[PDB]
Design an enzyme around this catalytic site. Structure first.
Site, PDB file in Angstrom:
ATOM      1  N   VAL B  78       8.363  21.626   4.891  1.00  0.00           N
ATOM      2  CA  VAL B  78       7.168  22.053   5.601  1.00  0.00           C
ATOM      3  C   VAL B  78       6.617  20.871   6.392  1.00  0.00           C
ATOM      4  CG1 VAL B  78       4.894  23.067   5.352  1.00  0.00           C
ATOM      5  CG2 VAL B  78       6.724  23.727   3.772  1.00  0.00           C
ATOM      6  N   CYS B 161       1.459  12.458 -14.819  1.00  0.00           N
ATOM      7  CA  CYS B 161       1.713  11.973 -16.169  1.00  0.00           C
ATOM      8  C   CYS B 161       1.120  10.581 -16.324  1.00  0.00           C
ATOM      9  CB  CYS B 161       3.203  11.960 -16.489  1.00  0.00           C
ATOM     10  SG  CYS B 161       3.488  11.695 -18.229  1.00  0.00           S
ATOM     11  N   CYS B 339      -0.166  15.541 -22.888  1.00  0.00           N
ATOM     12  CA  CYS B 339       0.493  14.257 -22.669  1.00  0.00           C
ATOM     13  C   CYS B 339       1.278  13.902 -23.927  1.00  0.00           C
ATOM     14  CB  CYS B 339      -0.523  13.177 -22.326  1.00  0.00           C
ATOM     15  SG  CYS B 339       0.232  11.728 -21.621  1.00  0.00           S
TER      16      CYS B 339
HETATM   17  C1  LIG Z   1       8.597   9.906 -15.381  1.00  0.00           C
HETATM   18  C2  LIG Z   1       7.775  11.161 -15.517  1.00  0.00           C
HETATM   19  C3  LIG Z   1       7.501  11.661 -16.784  1.00  0.00           C
HETATM   20  C4  LIG Z   1       6.735  12.811 -16.947  1.00  0.00           C
HETATM   21  N1  LIG Z   1       6.494  13.270 -18.230  1.00  0.00           N
HETATM   22  C5  LIG Z   1       5.791  14.351 -18.370  1.00  0.00           C
HETATM   23  C6  LIG Z   1       5.562  14.845 -19.717  1.00  0.00           C
HETATM   24  O1  LIG Z   1       5.966  14.325 -20.760  1.00  0.00           O
HETATM   25  N2  LIG Z   1       4.794  15.994 -19.758  1.00  0.00           N
HETATM   26  C7  LIG Z   1       4.274  16.666 -18.664  1.00  0.00           C
HETATM   27  O2  LIG Z   1       3.606  17.688 -18.852  1.00  0.00           O
HETATM   28  N3  LIG Z   1       4.504  16.190 -17.406  1.00  0.00           N
HETATM   29  C8  LIG Z   1       5.231  15.104 -17.278  1.00  0.00           C
HETATM   30  N4  LIG Z   1       5.493  14.647 -16.010  1.00  0.00           N
HETATM   31  C9  LIG Z   1       4.868  15.323 -14.881  1.00  0.00           C
HETATM   32  C10 LIG Z   1       5.644  16.501 -14.327  1.00  0.00           C
HETATM   33  O3  LIG Z   1       6.945  16.093 -13.908  1.00  0.00           O
HETATM   34  C11 LIG Z   1       4.896  17.007 -13.096  1.00  0.00           C
HETATM   35  O4  LIG Z   1       3.501  17.044 -13.383  1.00  0.00           O
HETATM   36  C12 LIG Z   1       5.363  18.363 -12.588  1.00  0.00           C
HETATM   37  O5  LIG Z   1       6.687  18.197 -12.086  1.00  0.00           O
HETATM   38  C13 LIG Z   1       4.444  18.898 -11.512  1.00  0.00           C
HETATM   39  O6  LIG Z   1       5.149  19.907 -10.755  1.00  0.00           O
HETATM   40  P1  LIG Z   1       4.780  20.204  -9.252  1.00  0.00           P
HETATM   41  O7  LIG Z   1       5.412  21.552  -8.893  1.00  0.00           O
HETATM   42  O8  LIG Z   1       3.298  20.104  -9.064  1.00  0.00           O
HETATM   43  O9  LIG Z   1       5.510  19.032  -8.459  1.00  0.00           O
HETATM   44  P2  LIG Z   1       7.072  18.757  -8.461  1.00  0.00           P
HETATM   45  O10 LIG Z   1       7.666  19.345  -9.715  1.00  0.00           O
HETATM   46  O11 LIG Z   1       7.335  17.324  -8.196  1.00  0.00           O
HETATM   47  O12 LIG Z   1       7.646  19.618  -7.251  1.00  0.00           O
HETATM   48  C14 LIG Z   1       7.153  19.460  -5.907  1.00  0.00           C
HETATM   49  C15 LIG Z   1       8.280  19.871  -5.001  1.00  0.00           C
HETATM   50  O13 LIG Z   1       7.819  19.907  -3.634  1.00  0.00           O
HETATM   51  C16 LIG Z   1       8.868  19.477  -2.804  1.00  0.00           C
HETATM   52  N5  LIG Z   1       8.290  19.024  -1.537  1.00  0.00           N
HETATM   53  C17 LIG Z   1       7.615  17.857  -1.304  1.00  0.00           C
HETATM   54  N6  LIG Z   1       7.190  17.724  -0.068  1.00  0.00           N
HETATM   55  C18 LIG Z   1       7.601  18.891   0.552  1.00  0.00           C
HETATM   56  C19 LIG Z   1       7.454  19.375   1.870  1.00  0.00           C
HETATM   57  N7  LIG Z   1       6.836  18.706   2.846  1.00  0.00           N
HETATM   58  N8  LIG Z   1       7.981  20.590   2.159  1.00  0.00           N
HETATM   59  C20 LIG Z   1       8.609  21.261   1.191  1.00  0.00           C
HETATM   60  N9  LIG Z   1       8.803  20.908  -0.082  1.00  0.00           N
HETATM   61  C21 LIG Z   1       8.276  19.706  -0.340  1.00  0.00           C
HETATM   62  C22 LIG Z   1       9.599  18.404  -3.607  1.00  0.00           C
HETATM   63  O14 LIG Z   1      10.939  18.283  -3.150  1.00  0.00           O
HETATM   64  C23 LIG Z   1       9.515  18.965  -5.034  1.00  0.00           C
HETATM   65  O15 LIG Z   1      10.672  19.720  -5.386  1.00  0.00           O
HETATM   66  C24 LIG Z   1       6.251  13.478 -15.811  1.00  0.00           C
HETATM   67  C25 LIG Z   1       6.522  12.985 -14.541  1.00  0.00           C
HETATM   68  C26 LIG Z   1       7.283  11.829 -14.384  1.00  0.00           C
HETATM   69  C27 LIG Z   1       7.557  11.303 -13.003  1.00  0.00           C
HETATM   70  S   LIG Z   2      -0.443  12.201 -19.782  1.00  0.00           S
HETATM   71  S   LIG Z   3       2.697  13.336 -19.088  1.00  0.00           S
END
Ligand SMILES: Cc1cc2nc3c(=O)[nH]c(=O)nc-3n(C[C@H](O)[C@H](O)[C@H](O)COP(=O)(O)OP(=O)(O)OC[C@H]3O[C@@H](n4cnc5c(N)ncnc54)[C@H](O)[C@@H]3O)c2cc1C
Ligand SMILES: [S]
Ligand SMILES: [S]
Ligand SMILES: Cc1cc2nc3c(=O)[nH]c(=O)nc-3n(C[C@H](O)[C@H](O)[C@H](O)COP(=O)(O)OP(=O)(O)OC[C@H]3O[C@@H](n4cnc5c(N)ncnc54)[C@H](O)[C@@H]3O)c2cc1C
Ligand SMILES: COC1=C(OC)C(=O)C(CC=C(C)C)=C(C)C1=O
Ligand SMILES: COC1=C(OC)C(=O)C(CC=C(C)C)=C(C)C1=O
Ligand SMILES: COC1=C(OC)C(=O)C(CC=C(C)C)=C(C)C1=O
Ligand SMILES: [S]
Ligand SMILES: [S]
Lengths: 407, 406
Positions: B78, B161, B339
């Site tokens: 996007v 996180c 968490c």
């Molecule tokens: C190291 C690490 C450890 C974690 N541990 C935990 C844990 O123990 N427990 C927990 O609850 N959470 C944990 N998390 C957090 C969890 O991974 C995220 O909070 C969760 O993935 C949020 O999902 P989301 O859909 O909001 O974003 P995401 O899952 O990151 O997905 C967003 C998507 O949007 C896409 N995107 C980005 N920009 C664009 C664009 N311009 N156009 C189209 N698509 C786009 C990306 O490619 C991606 O696929 C952790 C995160 C990390 C990095």
């Molecule tokens: S967290």
């Molecule tokens: S987390």
């Protein structure tokens, strides 16, 4: 590519001032200013315009008349920056290259992030001192006030002149006493912040005013919606997410949420939050050594004021001259900023402080008192100093005066 | 041009989860997902990958493999949102229109706002669990550690996180004890914040761990530059502007500054800070009533976690069903997030809390204790539940379990 030794982005307070100072260092023919606005505004007086004490027309002058003589005015908007290639894009489909870049793009007003604004300004009883288009509406709402709530807001963002949203509250209170309708006014300040002011000396003097003049302050309370046709406003409780509160008003002064200019938000020159990422002491850019920033668009962690711009312009002038001869800058900005808190139609508490948010006052007297002298300075002397001294590059803040006195 | 009843932006945790739930509501043929990445990662397990307790290969599957069957995958980024005209633009120059829009674009990692990154990662002794490209460098740095400062950082921005930056520090501490070189490590957490954790019950638990296991925490200290070739890290003192400190390290773990995705920063759907501007209880957009948001990209004032996403997904499912039936949404999101604080290779403190930063514990025991049961839940059960229940639209958080255990 059109090319300038020194390119200045923005023709406001920092931008005009830095152009005048650079014109003397490299010659006017080698300086350019990119600025779309036909008109240059001394924004601090807008506090008094909205309280009926000053005329709006006198706050502005044609941008052409404040461009330092001989400097090229590029009337256009910056649409992209490409520091890796020492150039920028403009909305005239031109690219402009530079040897040195000074970024002075100010802060962006985001009225539309409040549901019901800016279309709601079409209705009576609502104004904003932050916009040339709504500052006189503040004054008409004050004049027309009959009875009920008079509400003033503070958003959940960085702002420019953090003192101004409550300056207009104190002037409104004084206007209700002078016209005999103070008993019919329930005066409320709904501020996203946790405290009336960021520096204790002045916070305390301001709290005394809050008590003596029977003003109500609700902290951690952010305006999220205005229903201007029904004269209601909706606030969220930042401490209890999801909780809102609807409250009618007989007058509403909106301080809009604010943010970095849209073109900087996604630019390589921004930090993670979208502000220009400069050294805190030299204003040289953290990652591009030929880029500099001044004023509201920077991430300098001090109040965003024109007094800060003044104090920053004196540092940046030196920084650029030192960098121009491949040397290490040595003079360091201290975070100086100032806040002439208008507490009435004839008083100002002149707050001055630095990066440590501790008082750094210019005059040998207690500036935490409400003063006639400080009101006259803000209302009358500061506009003159701005047009005739700061914009010509001869005002770098009052540090020399402060050291002149304490002697 | 192409039009979909329900357009989902982002094919990550919330994107796939919502597309699955919506498929059941409008039919697969009326749902589309815009997502550029070929791989879908379960990111939580990167904490354990960085510590060499799990494999990077197993945290990701092909994006095609998690798209709900029948749901169109538009492989693109996007580049513009025009909610006033019910359409978005992508980077192959296509205008796509919608009846309803779900934004699930996640959070953006800004390594390059740290002077000296990401080029620093080409050098040894430096890593980051937040990127597929650097999580294995964390583990390499951990094994290669000989003697010196082991430095863990936390930036001056919002983050996803918030516990993961200390999680890998505790894992690193246990690794050094287990390989005999604990006496050779000075372990330091340099955090922009002024507290170890925002919920006091778990902050007190972590405080005891910090004291018992000889960890230094320096508050209001923010990493601003890496000089990886000299193994030096530069910190600013947020309490004294202008003041910095240059520290040598033997291992550096970077948590990068983070921000809303670039395309959302300047978008009408954003609030002033650039986050998707949604009702904090219904997740419907404040100003565009056919727009919704979930996950890291929203301005929901709770922790940015996958667990929050799951609890959000149940609420948003109800919000969108109720709207499509010309009813006003009533069920309210409470800010639930979790968490699973890994404190070592066998123990998790399971923090669970809500909008008021008060514990909201699913299980009937005290979760501020280090628990083996909780570690096995994080390391082995949650990945299973993620891939097979959450991404299929059948996991809305553990509120029903909680009430059953109480
Ligand atoms: C190291 C690490 C450890 C974690 N541990 C935990 C844990 O123990 N427990 C927990 O609850 N959470 C944990 N998390 C957090 C969890 O991974 C995220 O909070 C969760 O993935 C949020 O999902 P989301 O859909 O909001 O974003 P995401 O899952 O990151 O997905 C967003 C998507 O949007 C896409 N995107 C980005 N920009 C664009 C664009 N311009 N156009 C189209 N698509 C786009 C990306 O490619 C991606 O696929 C952790 C995160 C990390 C990095
Ligand atoms: S967290
Ligand atoms: S987390
Ligand atoms: C109501 C009010 C009261 C105030 N009172 C005080 C006070 O008492 N004391 C005090 O010290 N300060 C006060 N201020 C603040 C003061 O006006 C500002 O801090 C000062 O103007 C900052 O200067 P600047 O150059 O950074 O920004 P500005 O002076 O706002 O200039 C920014 C310029 O950049 C231009 N620009 C923006 N985007 C682009 C683009 N994409 N391309 C090109 N040009 C662009 C704009 O057109 C503008 O001309 C007040 C402000 C307000 C609103
Ligand atoms: C609602 O706003 C008000 C305050 O907030 C700053 C006060 O402190 C006070 C002062 C109260 C004490 C105990 C000094 C009053 C009277 C008030 O109305
Ligand atoms: C107009 O903006 C302002 C300045 O820039 C011109 C100042 O230098 C100062 C500081 C000047 C003195 C004499 C303290 C103030 C207060 C101010 O409001
Ligand atoms: C994968 O990330 C996570 C979730 O999403 C599936 C959860 O639901 C939960 C909550 C689940 C339970 C059983 C408390 C946690 C703790 C978690 O870490
Ligand atoms: S100000
Ligand atoms: S101010």
């Amino acid at each position: 590519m059109n090319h300038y030794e020194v390119l200045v982005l923005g023709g406001g307070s920092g931008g005009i001032t830095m152009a005048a100072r650079m014109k003397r260092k490299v010659g006017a023919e080698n300086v350019a200013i990119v600025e779309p606005s036909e008109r240059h505004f001394y924004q601090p007086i807008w506090t008094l315009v909205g309280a009926g004490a000053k005329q709006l027309s006198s706050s502005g002058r044609p941008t052409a008349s404040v461009i330092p003589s001989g400097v090229e005015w590029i009337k256009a908007r910056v649409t992209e920056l490409n520091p890796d290639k020492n150039c920028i894009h403009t909305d005239d489909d031109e690219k402009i290259s530079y040897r040195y870049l000074i970024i002075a793009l100010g802060i962006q007003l985001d009225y539309e992030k409040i549901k019901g604004l800016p279309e709601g300004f079409a209705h009576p009883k609502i104004g904003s001192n932050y916009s040339v288009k709504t500052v006189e509406k503040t004054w008409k709402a004050l004049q027309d006030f009959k009875e009920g709530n008079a509400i003033f807001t503070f958003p959940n963002t960085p702002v420019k002149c953090a003192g101004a949203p409550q300056k207009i509250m104190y002037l409104s209170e004084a206007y209700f006493r002078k016209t005999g309708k103070r008993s019919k006014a329930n005066i409320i300040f709904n501020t996203s912040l946790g405290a009336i002011f960021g520096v204790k000396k002045y916070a305390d003097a301001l709290q005394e005013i809050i008590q003596e003049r029977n003003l109500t302050v609700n902290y951690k309370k952010n305006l999220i919606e205005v229903r201007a046709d029904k004269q209601e406003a909706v606030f969220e409780n930042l401490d209890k997410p999801g909780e809102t509160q609807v409250i009618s008003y007989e007058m509403l002064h909106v301080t809009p949420p604010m943010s970095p200019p849209d073109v900087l938000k996604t630019s390589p020159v921004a930090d993670a939050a979208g502000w220009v990422d400069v050294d805190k002491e030299t204003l040289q850019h953290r990652r591009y050594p030929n880029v500099f920033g001044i004023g509201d668009c920077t991430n300098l962690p001090t109040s965003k004021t024109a007094a800060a711009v003044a104090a920053q312009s004196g540092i940046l002038d030196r920084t650029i001259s030192v960098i121009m001869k491949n040397q290490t800058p040595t003079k360091k900005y201290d975070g100086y900023t100032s806040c002439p808190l208008v507490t009435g139609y004839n008083r100002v508490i002149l707050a001055e402080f630095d990066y440590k948010a501790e008082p750094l006052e210019t005059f040998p007297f207690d500036q935490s008192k409400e003063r006639l002298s400080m009101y006259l300075m803000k209302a009358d002397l500061m506009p003159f100093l701005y047009w005739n001294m700061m914009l010509r590059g001869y005002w770098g803040g009052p540090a020399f005066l402060r050291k002149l006195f304490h002697l």
